[PDB]
Amino acid sequence: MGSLSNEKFFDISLVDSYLNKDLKNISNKIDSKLN
Amino acid sequence: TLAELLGRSRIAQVANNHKPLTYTGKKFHPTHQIIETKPSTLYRQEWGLKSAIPSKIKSRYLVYNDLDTLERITTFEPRGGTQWNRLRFQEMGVPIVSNIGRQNPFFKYISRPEDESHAKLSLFKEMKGDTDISPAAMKKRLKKITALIRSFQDEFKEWLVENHPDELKLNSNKLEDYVVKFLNKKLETKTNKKFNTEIIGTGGLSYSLPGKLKNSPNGVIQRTVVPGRILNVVKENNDNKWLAAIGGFVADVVFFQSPPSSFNSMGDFIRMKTFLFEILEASMEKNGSVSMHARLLEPQ
Amino acid sequence: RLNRIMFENNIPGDKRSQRFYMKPGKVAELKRSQRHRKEFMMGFKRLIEIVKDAKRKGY
Amino acid sequence: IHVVPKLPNSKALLQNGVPNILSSSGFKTVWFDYQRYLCDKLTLATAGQSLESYYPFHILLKTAGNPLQSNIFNLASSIHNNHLFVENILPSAVEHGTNSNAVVKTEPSRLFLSKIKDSFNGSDWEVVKEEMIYRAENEVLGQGWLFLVENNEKKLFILTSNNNGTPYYFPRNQSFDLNSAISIDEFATLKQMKELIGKSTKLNGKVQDWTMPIICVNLWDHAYLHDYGVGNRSKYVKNVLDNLNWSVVNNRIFSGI
Amino acid sequence: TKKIDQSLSKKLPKGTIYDPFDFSMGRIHLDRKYQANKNSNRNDIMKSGANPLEFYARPRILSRYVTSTGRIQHRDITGLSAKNQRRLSKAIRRCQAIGLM
Amino acid sequence: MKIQTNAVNVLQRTSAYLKSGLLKETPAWYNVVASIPPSTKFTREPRFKNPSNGHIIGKLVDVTEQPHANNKGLYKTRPNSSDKRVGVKRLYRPPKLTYVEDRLRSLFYKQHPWELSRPKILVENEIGDENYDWSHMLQIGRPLDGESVIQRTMYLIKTKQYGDMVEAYDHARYEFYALRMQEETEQQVALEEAEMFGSLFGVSAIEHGIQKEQEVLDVWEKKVVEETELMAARTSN
Amino acid sequence: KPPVYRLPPLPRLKVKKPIIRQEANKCLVLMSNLLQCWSSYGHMSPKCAGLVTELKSCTSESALGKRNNVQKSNINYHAARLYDRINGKPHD
Amino acid sequence: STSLWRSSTQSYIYGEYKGIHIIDLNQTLSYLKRAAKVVEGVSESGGIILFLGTRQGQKRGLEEAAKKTHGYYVSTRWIPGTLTNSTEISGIWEKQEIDSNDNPTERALSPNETSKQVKPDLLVVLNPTENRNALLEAIKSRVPTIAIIDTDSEPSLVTYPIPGNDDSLRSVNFLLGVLARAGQRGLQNRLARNNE
RNA sequence: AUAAUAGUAAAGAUGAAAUAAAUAAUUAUAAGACUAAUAUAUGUGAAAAUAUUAAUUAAAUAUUAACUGACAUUGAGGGAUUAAAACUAGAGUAGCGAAACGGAUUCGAUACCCGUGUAGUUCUAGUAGUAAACUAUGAAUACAAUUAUUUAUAUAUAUAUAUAUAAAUAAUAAAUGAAAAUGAAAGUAUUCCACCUGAAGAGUACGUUAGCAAUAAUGAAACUCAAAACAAUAGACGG
Ligand SMILES: [K+]
Ligand SMILES: [K+]
Ligand SMILES: [K+]
Ligand SMILES: [K+]
Ligand SMILES: [K+]
Ligand SMILES: [K+]
Ligand SMILES: [K+]
Ligand SMILES: [Mg+2]
Ligand SMILES: [Mg+2]
Ligand SMILES: [Mg+2]
Ligand SMILES: [Mg+2]
Ligand SMILES: [Mg+2]
Ligand SMILES: [Mg+2]
Ligand SMILES: [Mg+2]
Ligand SMILES: [Mg+2]
Ligand SMILES: [Mg+2]
Ligand SMILES: [Mg+2]
Ligand SMILES: [Mg+2]
Ligand SMILES: [Mg+2]
Ligand SMILES: [Mg+2]
Ligand SMILES: [Mg+2]
């Protein structure tokens, strides 16, 4: 999963995607797809 | 070339084996390939091995580990007795049946994913089937795999947001399901333990198909009667059945109602006498043993 | 049974060895020689087993 | 590998068959095809085992007492029996291929006709042939073999076998068909045979039998159907016994010189 | 007498194959000679890959490698590797100094 | 042991005896040995290829031949310590012969342990006569056994009918099961048919085993009794 | 893994005092049982009748019964015969 | 076994397999042909060929090889000194004179001719590792020798080595048979030239 | 060792002996020294040394990556460390134990054995720099035929073995050697240092330097002799 993981104890992938505009550019992408 | 010929030679055909020739544990199946020499070759100590077998050996069957050793001898035992166990099983004409009603392993059946619904049970069996693995080679299954699985992150970071985006925004109960399937789907192409060393079916003990009746001059045989021996004079402790020695196999004997009085009389010498038994069924366990169930037919 | 415990814990041997003082150099020499004899006996028994096995097979 | 033996005057046999018994097609079935069929199956059964280095006659004796080697015994017995039949019905045992010999008049010897009278209460050879034809029709319902055998007492007698029954070893003669009903006299013979086999002390449970065949007739469908047809096997046995090669049959009787 | 000592009779397990020799005295003697504690490895923590020095506060596990009087067993008896024997002995000596063993 | 000189120079030492006159008559072997000189080099010879798998011996992969990054993600820019050690010994050590078929053979007998109980004859007849067509498993001249499966698997992978060795192996295994089942039935039926026509057998396999077990169990009875009487007396002490 | 210990070259391979098993005399054990039978059930008790009869037969001709009263070990003969073959010594 | 390797045989080894060294049969064939030609030459020249083999079971092969080459054999024990101390060991035994057809001339031999050493012209040794004495005597006596050289055997001790398994009676009898027939052909070619 | 407790009449020692409310048992207290098994000094350390536990500080391994670019080897003089004994000063002193005084043994016994036991053995701060300080074998580099056994790293998989490459040890080929033997050196070569030139006199004398001292280092000659020494062989002899 990496950034898109459900684990309470996540890895640095999540923190990297945050600072790299990936967890945000994917949340908007998913929401835009839902639209 | 000489190398090509050697690979196909009869000595090459025997698979490498270093298992103890003197084993005192539990024996469930043959461990060494029986070697046989003809009478003419035996007269000349010729067995097709590297060196002549000592003339003291009068048997025509042996089992060996090494063609030669640092002690300048062949490591062999002049015995071939597992063949008589197989041939005695054939004479009892009891087909081996699955107690779980599984498909016949010797037929190419069209199977489906009925049992594949346990993808998370067996995909993790590769890392969890490590009962007897080294403390660090098993630990190499953690970093080596992590990198391989971590190389599919981009593929699963796009497929999951294109095939099941709702789960990524609602719950991971289904996401975990898509993960187990993803790896297996991307692993079926891979070759992890592509060769399975588990025993296939009977292991070669019997190739008889159930169903056939035994015609005899006295009519069709309905119950198979086989001479045997009772080993213990007291039922197996914690078990409601005694043990018998029938045709090179140890079976569990169930008595009609009572135990014959020769038991108490004979005592610990009960094995000195031969009784007649009926072989109810024969099953195969995963350890490679045969579970033979018998019945002490007593003159009545 | 009690005697077996004494001999498996070397109680009688230790008591006798503590009656008189031995110089460290002599102690080391005796420990080296005893180990050699123990290992030598193990090598001897291994060779006798090979002989018996070889005899049984007709060599 | 067991190979089909080469027969004398094989070119004639593949063109004109065996005169007065079988045609060219009939002989190709009984020998060139069936003997190939048997030898190949024997090779597949015995290759890789000690039996591969033994001739079929020795194989049947070695395996006669082993219940689970009956398949090998059957193949060895049939192969030996078939070449015993093809040998005494053959125009000439000597190879007159380059001598173009067309005069082979072989007649029963005096030792054979003397043992026939002694063993059959003065019956003539012609009468014994009728008994042989009768025995085949009433004792061999299906496949089998008809033999004229000699025992250790110098007496010639008639033995019939069902399927592949050896004449040499009485425990495997297969002369009684137990699929049908048997009389108390036949059961007595079987019971007495079982007792003899139980008196042997050998760990292989084998007995001594010195019976030897003198004449062999193949009663299998591979030998007569194509030329005679279902139901005409008695006409086939009559022709075989009337056109036997007596140079071979006479040599099978021990003289002692 | 209808009784025999257990040392004079062999009990053939269930599901195993046997030869006629398995009923002889030679089998009895042969089984005694080749009777080694080879099943210990699967039950021997110190032969599994764990570091014996992590058990210095668990006297119960350490007490499996000392005699009745507390004498550390020689490597010939424990069957451990040189490193594990070295580490195990250190663990036991440390355990003794802490007041647990 | 030192390389001997006097065994291969018998002709030259003999010629000195004849030229001087110490030996009057030429030996019968003298002319024969002169025409067929002995080999007298006794040298160690290098080898540059494993004959079994064709692996090249004595080849060093230079850093120029490894331009791409490794499994660790690093480029190789200099020779490593192993590359800088002379490897002359590998040229002279007899190569270890290996075969893919050996791996399948070990698998087959691990999957079918009882195939080991079928006796195998290691004595060869004539390797040069084997004319086998491995399009089919059965062959005239050899038994049906594990080797039949392995050779069939190799033919399938050699003809490229199957790509993966596992798939070819499984295909061969089923052909082996079919042939094994036809033979198990031919033997059972042959025994049944013979008994139905009056065939009699002295001792069966089951009976043979019972008799052998009795012989052993009788000696065991005596010893047990003897050793259960020495114990009783010795324990009385 | 079990440590193999290899000996240096030796002038001989010999057992100083080979252990030979010596079976017990059947008459002595018969006497040892009869003596015990008398210790429990009493001397001349009818319970020891069979013991007395057996002892008399065992000792009738020789008080220790006829026995194979000889046994020697051959380990040293074989050890000396096979040592050079099995010692694993390097070639000369 | 590779553990028993005598590294002086390195050039004869094809490889190792199943814990043993595999001898290169291409070299065995070339060495065998050369050795066979030597036996044929000596036989055709009328020389004395002795076949020495002291391993159990070799007698039958050794006796027939001697018979078909009109040679000699020793299967029981090589007496140390048979060649170097021949007068103390073999002087008492009887000699005979023969013609070019190998038929006894029947001429009585002077005591001078019956005490002279009768040295073999060629020595064939089946098991050289157990016959060092004979090989060294052959060297001292300038007698060419042929022997089967296994991977643990010293090649330089013999004039014409034949690399090959010396432990199997089949391998030994196969190599001995080839050498014996080569001798037979030499003998037949010598008897034929006398006729014509 | 001291005290208590009950309990007693011998205890202790030796080849046998004799010299100096106990001994034994159960408690309590004090003191000094030592470190059972594991254990192979395996390993570690330059050597000397180093094995009850923990902690702090310092040093030490393999592979890979990058970097420096011959910066190396050896090493006169010099420097540092260096067992046991010994000495200086101050503490300590259970046990052991030169000496001394006694008891025995013996023809005698300045001994071996026993008792009482001082210096010493322990710690702190120093002096001194000697041992069969030994592998009686200086250090470095290149190289040469095998096996076995461990260890380490790596590789593979049909997962627990298998395959590799080093190190250690054992037995060897070759080679070397007076041989015993050495065996990766006591082999094949190269480089640097130390040292030797018949025995005895002598590691002495004298001088010098250093030390609180004992001593340590350096280190001769005359006279006399045709000896003297090593390995191995066959004997003889051995409480
Ligand atoms: K050390
Ligand atoms: K530069
Ligand atoms: K410098
Ligand atoms: K200096
Ligand atoms: K003190
Ligand atoms: K030393
Ligand atoms: K130096
Ligand atoms: Mg050999
Ligand atoms: Mg006290
Ligand atoms: Mg300690
Ligand atoms: Mg060390
Ligand atoms: Mg320096
Ligand atoms: Mg002081
Ligand atoms: Mg004193
Ligand atoms: Mg100082
Ligand atoms: Mg001094
Ligand atoms: Mg000095
Ligand atoms: Mg020292
Ligand atoms: Mg340095
Ligand atoms: Mg001085
Ligand atoms: Mg000396």
Curated annotation (Swiss-Prot), chain A:
It comes from the Eukaryota. It is found in: Mitochondrion. Present with 2010 molecules/cell in log phase SD medium. Belongs to the mitochondrion-specific ribosomal protein mS26 family. Component of the mitochondrial ribosome (mitoribosome), a dedicated translation machinery responsible for the synthesis of mitochondrial genome-encoded proteins, including at least some of the essential transmembrane subunits of the mitochondrial respiratory chain. The mitoribosomes are attached to the mitochondrial inner membrane and translation products are cotranslationally integrated into the membrane. Component of the mitochondrial small ribosomal subunit (mt-SSU). Mature yeast 74S mitochondrial ribosomes consist of a small (37S) and a large (54S) subunit. The 37S small subunit contains a 15S ribosomal RNA (15S mt-rRNA) and 34 different proteins. The 54S large subunit contains a 21S rRNA (21S mt-rRNA) and 46 different proteins. This is Small ribosomal subunit protein mS26.
From Swiss-Prot, chain C:
Component of the mitochondrial small ribosomal subunit (mt-SSU). Mature yeast 74S mitochondrial ribosomes consist of a small (37S) and a large (54S) subunit. The 37S small subunit contains a 15S ribosomal RNA (15S mt-rRNA) and 34 different proteins. The 54S large subunit contains a 21S rRNA (21S mt-rRNA) and 46 different proteins. It is found in: Mitochondrion. Changing residue 3 to K: In MRP21-3; suppresses translation defects of mutations in the 5'-untranslated leaders of mitochondrial mRNAs. It comes from the Eukaryota. Present with 1270 molecules/cell in log phase SD medium. The chain holds residues 119 to 177 of 177 of the full protein. Belongs to the bacterial ribosomal protein bS21 family. This is Small ribosomal subunit protein bS21m. Component of the mitochondrial ribosome (mitoribosome), a dedicated translation machinery responsible for the synthesis of mitochondrial genome-encoded proteins, including at least some of the essential transmembrane subunits of the mitochondrial respiratory chain. The mitoribosomes are attached to the mitochondrial inner membrane and translation products are cotranslationally integrated into the membrane. It comes from Saccharomyces cerevisiae (strain ATCC 204508 / S288c).
From Swiss-Prot, chain E:
One of its GO terms (biological process) is translation. GO terms for molecular function: small ribosomal subunit rRNA binding; structural constituent of ribosome. It comes from the Eukaryota. Keywords: Mitochondrion, Ribonucleoprotein, Ribosomal protein, Transit peptide. Present with 1210 molecules/cell in log phase SD medium. GO terms for cellular component: mitochondrial inner membrane; mitochondrial small ribosomal subunit; mitochondrion. Belongs to the bacterial ribosomal protein bS18 family. It is found in: Mitochondrion. This is Small ribosomal subunit protein bS18m. Component of the mitochondrial small ribosomal subunit (mt-SSU). Mature yeast 74S mitochondrial ribosomes consist of a small (37S) and a large (54S) subunit. The 37S small subunit contains a 15S ribosomal RNA (15S mt-rRNA) and 34 different proteins. The 54S large subunit contains a 21S rRNA (21S mt-rRNA) and 46 different proteins. Component of the mitochondrial ribosome (mitoribosome), a dedicated translation machinery responsible for the synthesis of mitochondrial genome-encoded proteins, including at least some of the essential transmembrane subunits of the mitochondrial respiratory chain. The mitoribosomes are attached to the mitochondrial inner membrane and translation products are cotranslationally integrated into the membrane.
Swiss-Prot record, chain G:
One of its GO terms (molecular function) is structural constituent of ribosome. It comes from the Eukaryota. Component of the mitochondrial small ribosomal subunit (mt-SSU). Mature yeast 74S mitochondrial ribosomes consist of a small (37S) and a large (54S) subunit. The 37S small subunit contains a 15S ribosomal RNA (15S mt-rRNA) and 34 different proteins. The 54S large subunit contains a 21S rRNA (21S mt-rRNA) and 46 different proteins. Transmembrane segments: none annotated. A motif (Cx9C motif 1) lies at residues 27-37. GO terms for biological process: mitochondrial translation. One of its GO terms (cellular component) is mitochondrial inner membrane. The keyword Ribosomal protein applies. It is found in: Mitochondrion; Mitochondrion matrix. Present with 259 molecules/cell in log phase SD medium. Component of the mitochondrial ribosome (mitoribosome), a dedicated translation machinery responsible for the synthesis of mitochondrial genome-encoded proteins, including at least some of the essential transmembrane subunits of the mitochondrial respiratory chain. The mitoribosomes are attached to the mitochondrial inner membrane and translation products are cotranslationally integrated into the membrane. Belongs to the mitochondrion-specific ribosomal protein mS37 family. The gene is MRP10. Disulfide bonds join 27-58, 37-48. The keyword Transport does not apply. This is Small ribosomal subunit protein mS37. Its main location: mitochondrion. A motif (Cx9C motif 2) lies at residues 48-58. Keywords: Disulfide bond, Mitochondrion, Ribonucleoprotein, Ribosomal protein. Residues 24-66 form the CHCH domain.
